[PDB]
Subunit: 188 residues, 4 copies
């Protein structure tokens, strides 16, 4: 085709960035896909800034945002608030949408951040994909871990110093491959 | 054929009427098989008493499942909740993973759970690993501003009024037909690949 | 007195009109001080003027801007935001993202929090915008108040209307041309009075 | 008159019951208060209760009186406990609440404090969404919603796996229900009970 997977993210201290690398790695496990990383501007490198126009080109868009009190961050919100023209044109209708996040605390918006993000994706006419429980990481009870059936996640700790765990990255890779696979099936 | 199940609870018929519209829409897609299934209870229901009962096991046969429930204070009704609470074995084996899931509802008032009933339902569908489909704004009914209307981007809906005397409007039923066709199209694309 | 702050963002004035009604309701309770505050705009200068938003916003230009610090002084904060695809708008999001210091100091813990919104379509985030907003208020340790069904407006079935048990709302139509109805404003007044009453009861401990 | 707190819960294997006793202990700390635990009726067929072992586990708290919809009107605050079922409250709790249409139309719960706690098998399988979806129902009832403020240190624990959310206390049962509530989880529940009781008392003594 190739099937086009965009990973649109904002990262403050690298947790979402590292998770985005993992989502990307997973999507890249599926043949005939083109993975494009896009970063969200604040209010170097060759990761372009997301624009509303470019989102139209995707078959799937996987969004990553750190939480801000259980909602997506203002940087992501501001970017999405600029997609009214894209909405008017039906630009994302029928495309696969998926979300991953990061939080400071164990249950401070690990889930709510994602489900509230889903709302916006639904207004854009997207089909929503999370992480199924066929991924063993989701049921881990041996170590503190992110990862939700709604989408992958990581924990940054109170001071932002915690690095994403191998369990959390595995879940994100799973999410990427799963989203890419569904998108490819829908696109062919 | 692509298999679509429409699994619903209805007390006074509003959700049943919507389910028939969903079904009509689904059947507008080639090579699909659409089955209405009613959720067991824990006069109006006799008017559709020839619809078979849904069982948790049979869900595994569908490519898409479209769930209908009246609201109960912004959540699905207990009859539906009890049905879904019986899908633990199906969850264990990953029986609904990758199947298309979609929801429609009915409420008494204009903003008493027209949306929250559906989004809380989506939570459960995601635990089952389903692909969630709502109603895109390509459906004009969603932006109707000339009459009181159900219909949400999260899924179709109708309004029954305080006494339950209001019947689904043409606009609400057309939105439901669209959802049925939309879901069946997406499911067919998945089932064939 | 019991202090009620109504913090809002508005682009074309719908939320601002609802905010005035919320204020009016809150004032119906004795010994209350009600203050409107607005959040900073993020939209580029040229976009504001090109979209006609600059003109509408200039209408309420005299309203002071909220700051994180000032929020501490309230007994209740009622937040108004237009929906953006079923979430609060980025202007409100950015203001709240600046309240980390306030969060660390537990500055809004035990305060009454409440929300109202505005949407283009009948069921395009009339409810989900508000419930997602509640999430944030809970992280701040706020007590959440909506609109009880003792307000008859919530069950009106004779005319298209905003108003939810989660918080008041209005509908702006596809072109934004619809203005708040009397039913919608009445529900907002009730919300304001209901919130103020709860806040007063809690504050006078 | 004493502030009245009801803790209304469903439990299959006892996790929610244990959290409920911790919530109650916390509520009792405020003084001039009456805290009552009430359980909702079981829906599971008798044979299933027996073969699943649930009959036996529930018997451990079988003497807790059963809540009825009308009794809820007696409380200043109601704290609801439910295990998650795929990120919603369980059907037992749902059926009980579906029976509160009378209270709803009479405004019987308006202005009362409502609060929620939960239990899940996995770390992020509905620890939050079960609670936020519950809040929807409580808002239809016109209740004042209270969660758990971050003044509770347990919420930011990053040394051990723990439940506890700013939306309400929670515990983790593990994939097979083998995990029992931790001290951290019970501490958070205790705080929730005290916090809810404090808010309710302030509202109650200011009629
Ligand atoms: C970028 C953008 C996205 C919007 N998305 C929706 C939407 O998805 N659903 C909806 O019903 N209204 C939507 N609206 C409409 C509004 O929220 C807004 O026009 C209306 O509430 C006016 O409030 P205000 O005059 O205070 O700004 C959107 C508006 C904008 C600018
Ligand atoms: C303003 C602000 C508010 C936050 N509030 C919460 C919160 O309430 N609960 C929580 O668990 N984490 C909260 N966080 C934590 C972050 O989201 C965390 O820093 C993030 O996961 C870091 O990932 P990043 O490096 O990609 O930005 C907050 C962070 C910020 C900046
Ligand atoms: C116990 C109960 C609680 C209800 N609560 C609400 C409510 O809070 N908000 C609302 O808008 N409708 C509420 N309803 C109304 C319905 O959901 C309505 O009867 C339904 O749409 C009927 O569809 P059906 O005929 O297919 O069962 C409630 C109904 C019942 C029985
Ligand atoms: C039908 C069913 C579905 C469940 N689904 C989930 C789930 O999706 N996510 C989760 O984390 N736990 C899930 N659980 C596990 C429980 O909720 C857990 O066993 C419960 O908290 C035990 O509390 P109790 O002993 O008070 O009943 C499910 C349990 C059952 C029976």
């Amino acid at each position: 085709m190739p099937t086009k997977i965009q990973i649109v993210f904002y990262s403050s201290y690298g947790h979402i960035y590292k998770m985005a690398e993992a989502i990307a790695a997973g999507a890249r496990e599926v043949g005939d896909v083109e993975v494009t990383l896009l970063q969200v501007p604040e209010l170097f490198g060759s990761i372009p800034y997301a624009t509303p126009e470019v989102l139209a080109e995707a078959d799937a868009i996987i969004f990553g945002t750190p939480t801000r009190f259980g909602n997506m961050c203002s940087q992501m919100r501001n970017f999405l608030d600029q997609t009214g023209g894209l909405w008017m044109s039906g630009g994302l209708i029928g495309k696969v949408g998926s979300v991953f996040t990061s939080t400071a605390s164990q249950h401070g918006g690990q889930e709510t951040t994602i489900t509230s993000f889903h709302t916006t994706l639904l207004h854009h006419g997207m089909v929503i994909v999370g992480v199924p429980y066929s991924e063993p990481g989701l049921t881990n009870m041996t170590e503190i871990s992110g990862g939700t059936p709604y989408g992958a996640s990581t924990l940054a700790g109170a001071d932002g110093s915690r690095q994403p765990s191998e369990n959390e990255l595995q879940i994100a890779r799973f999410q990427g491959k799963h989203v890419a696979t569904i998108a490819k099936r829908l696109a062919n």
